[PDB]
DNA sequence: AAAAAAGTTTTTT
DNA sequence: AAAAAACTTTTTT
């Protein structure tokens, strides 16, 4: 049983990137369950094999991370190219790991016939025939499906929890009491604003100490639909492998998700946040039923009640020690199940 | 020192 | 087979 990993349209290298260091986290795991796997990309690294020095078909599973395959500036992208060559190649069921709504599969070739550089490549080395079968982290699989309507190929969708991958490494351990020097933390991209209201609502005009860590910028809040006075310190992306330290630099951290994640996606974040040393609040929207922490506390469903939810955090070391003890708890609670998330993640990939 | 000019890297869906 | 920003390094006030 040979496995290989791919991510369909980022480079893999290391940390220094959120998709390379996606891949590398899932090929960690997947070693970990005692599976043979390896990660093809551009070129032989620490962590990889290159496309052109395999075989795809000498593998008896072939694993995709989703990407976007959009051609900025209408030029080549060898990453998403080279992974989709190699996807056409493979004779034998994909699966593809849908871990972010916006990045369902679709084919490059379309995209691609019409470009003045079309010829470098043909439809036969391109479009990608083989079954999909779509490995959502949502739990509704019918908004995973929705969002692959354009595919045909892609005949099979299963829900699994491919984010708990943070906690269940051998590796993981809980962030330990750190100095705070923040009341509120979020880190992230902006998502093309497909998250700014929320964005806006918890984090902008709160007279909180609040910073904003990752992709994001200032100046990309401009939709006069959520206008702002005073908005958050913004500073640079950190390595993935360095986020529950970040988020541990703050009372609180804030859990907000785009619309459709809401009581459907368990987002990675989730995890960084509940094992940090900032204690987790979540907006009321991203789960109504509390399935994450049963207990109110932890949720808030505006501006206001997250204010007066830091204040009280910052009044009461009691309190925010209680909550991350339970947090603390709760999130080994799901650790202990590791055994169940690695036969699912087997059974999923048909093993 | 501080501002402007050059050069380089990253982001954009 | 781009353009706009963001981020650095060098040259001028
Ligand atoms: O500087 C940063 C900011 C974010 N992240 C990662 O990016 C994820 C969030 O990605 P996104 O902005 O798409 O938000 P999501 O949809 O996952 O909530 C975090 O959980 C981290 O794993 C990171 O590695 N470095």
Redesign the pocket.
Same mark, same amino acid.
């Given at each position: 049983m040979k496995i290989a990993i791919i991510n369909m349209?980022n480079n893999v290298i290391n940390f $220094?990137?959120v998709p390379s260091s996606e891949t590398i986290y899932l090929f960690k795991v997947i070693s970990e369950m005692g599976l043979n796997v390896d990660i093809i990309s551009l070129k032989n690294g620490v962590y990889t094999k290159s496309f052109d020095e395999v075989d795809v078909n000498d593998y008896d599973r072939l694993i995709v991370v989703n &990407?976007?395959?959009?051609?900025?500036?209408? $030029?080549?992208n060898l990453a998403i190219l080279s992974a989709q060559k190699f996807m056409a190649k493979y004779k034998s069921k994909i699966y593809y790991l849908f871990t972010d709504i916006?990045?369902p599969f679709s084919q490059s070739w379309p995209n691609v016939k019409n470009?003045?550089?079309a010829?470098?490549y043909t439809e036969e080395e391109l479009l990608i025939k083989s079954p999909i079968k779509v490995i959502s982290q949502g739990i509704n699989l019918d908004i995973a499906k929705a969002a692959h309507k354009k595919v045909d190929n892609v005949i099979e969708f299963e829900y699994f929890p491919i984010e708990q991958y943070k906690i269940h490494m051998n590796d993981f351990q809980l962030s330990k009491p750190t100095k705070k020097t923040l009341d509120v933390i979020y880190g992230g &991209?902006?998502?093309?604003?497909q998250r700014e209201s929320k964005m806006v609502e918890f984090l902008f005009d709160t007279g909180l100490n609040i910073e904003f860590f990752g992709?994001?910028?200032? $100046?990309?809040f401009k939709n006069p639909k959520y206008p702002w006075t005073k908005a958050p310190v913004f500073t640079? $992306?950190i390595p993935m492998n360095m986020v529950s330290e970040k988020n541990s630099q703050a009372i609180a951290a804030l859990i907000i998700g785009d619309k459709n994640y809401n009581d459907n996606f368990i987002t990675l974040r989730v995890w960084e946040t509940m094992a940090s040393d900032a204690v987790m609040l979540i907006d009321e929207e991203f789960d109504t039923k509390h399935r994450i922490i049963n207990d109110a506390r932890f949720y808030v469903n505006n501006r206001a009640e997250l204010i007066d939810r830091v204040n009280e955090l910052k009044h009461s070391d009691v309190l925010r020690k209680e909550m991350l003890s339970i947090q603390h708890d709760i999130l080994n609670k799901t650790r202990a199940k590791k055994a169940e998330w690695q036969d699912a993640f087997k059974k999923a990939i048909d093993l």
């Open positions: 349209g $220094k990137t &990407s976007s395959i959009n051609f900025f500036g209408g $030029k080549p916006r990045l470009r003045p550089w010829y470098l &991209s902006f998502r093309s604003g992709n994001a910028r200032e $100046k990309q640079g $992306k």
